[PDB]
Amino acid sequence: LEAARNTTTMLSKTLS
Amino acid sequence: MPVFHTRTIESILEPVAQQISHLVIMHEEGEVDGKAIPDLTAPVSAVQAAVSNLVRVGKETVQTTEDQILKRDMPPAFIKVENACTKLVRAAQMLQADPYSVPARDYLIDGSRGILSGTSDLLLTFDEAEVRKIIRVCKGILEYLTVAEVVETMEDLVTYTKNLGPGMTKMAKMIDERQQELTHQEHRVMLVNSMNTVKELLPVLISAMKIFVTTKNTKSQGIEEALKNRNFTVEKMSAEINEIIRVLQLTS
C-alpha cells in the first residue's frame, strides 16, 4: 500500500 | 474537503491534498502575466512512474486476494489515477512551450485532483477490506455466543472456554489497533467503551454458565434463573459486538 506514498510524493514535489 | 478516515491514509494524503487547494485558490488570482509557470516535466516524469508502479502493485494485490469486493472496486481506481496522470503529463508538455497556457492551468488543476481522488479510492477500498477482516472475526464470535445455549457439561464448558478464549483475544488486538488507526475521536470511544464492556463480560459469562451447569446437574430449583442471567449475558455481549461491527463501518 505504500506505492501510494511514492505517488503522493512525486506529485507533491511537482507542485512548485 | 472531509477529513481522512485513518491516520495512515491521512499521512499519505494530507500533505498533498492541501497543496492542490493552494493551487485551486491560487490560480483564480493568476500569478503569471510575467511570473509564469516553470517546466515541470521532471516532476511529471516521476509521478507517471510512481503511478504505473501503483497500478503494478495494485494489480499484484488484486490477484493475491480472496476478497471480491476489493477485486471489483479496486480496478476503477487504477484507471482513474492512470487517466489523471496523462493530464498532468500533457500539461507539462504544454508548459514546455507556453508557460502561460490557460487550459494547462486547468490541466494541472484537474489532473492533480484526479491523482489524489483515485489514490484515496485505493486506500479506502484496501481499508474497507481490513475492516471486513475484523468484522468477520466479530461475526464468528457472535455465532460462538449462540452455541452457549447448548452447553450442559463441565467437560463441554472447558472446551468452550478453551475455544472461545482466544477468539476473544484476537478480536481485542484487532479493535485496539483499529481504534488507534482512526482519526475521529467520537468513534474511538464508541469502540473502546463497547469492547471494554465485552472484555468484562467474558468472565461473567463463564460464571453464569458454570452456575447453569451445576443447577442442571444438581436437580434443584432456580434453574430458570441461572438460565435467564446466562442468556442475558450473551444478549448483552452480542449487542456490544454488533455495535463494534456497526461503528467500524462509519465514515460520516
- Which of B188-204 are b and which e, b meaning 16 or more Cβ less than 10 Å from the residue's Cβ? bebbeebbebbeebbee
Residue B182 three-state SS: strand
Three-class DSSP category at B39: coil
- Extract the C-alpha cell encoding B226: 441461572
B161 three-class SS: helix
User: Does residue B6 sit in helix, strand or coil?
Assistant: strand
Is the C-alpha dihedral spanning B221, B224, B225, B230 positive or negative? positive
Q: Do domains B1-129 and B130-252 have the same CATH topology?
A: yes
Q: Within 10 Å of residue B50's Cβ, how many Cβ atoms?
A: 22
B19 touches chain A (CB under 8 A): yes
Q: Give the whole-angstrom CA distance, residue B88 versus residue B84.
A: 7
CB within 8 Å: A4 and B12: yes
- Give the DSSP H or E segment for A2: none
Contact A8 B16 (CB under 8 A): yes
Do B251 and B198 contact (CB within 8 A), yes or no? no
φ, ψ (nearest 5 deg) of residue A6 = -50, -55
- B112 with A1: Cβ contact below 8 A: no
- Give the angle B188-A4-B59 at the CA atoms, nearest 5°: 110
DSSP 8-state symbol, B183: S
Instruction: Cell numbers for B250, please give them.
Output: 462509519
- The domain limits of chain B are 1-129, 130-252
CATH architecture of B1-129: Up-down Bundle (1.20)
CA atoms of B234 and B23, how far apart (whole Å)? 55
Give the class (CATH, top level) of B130-252: mainly alpha
Distance CA B126, CA B119 (A): 11
Integer Cα distance of B38 and B97 in angstroms: 10
CA distances (Å), origin A12, targets B35, B112, B141: 21, 9, 44
- Under a CB-based contact definition with an 8 Å cutoff, are residues B122 and A4 in contact? yes
Query: Within 13 Å and on the Cβ side, how many CA atoms surround B148?
Result: 29
What contacts B112, CB < 8 A, 6 or more positions away?
A: A11, A15, B19, B20, B23, B84, B88
Task: Point out residues after which chain A has a gap (C–N over 2.5 Å).
Answer: none
Long-range contacts, B30-34 (Cβ 8 Å, 24+) = B32/B99, B32/B100, B33/B100
**Shortest CB distance from A10 goes to which of B20, B23, B47?**
B47
What technique was this entry resolved by?
A: X-ray
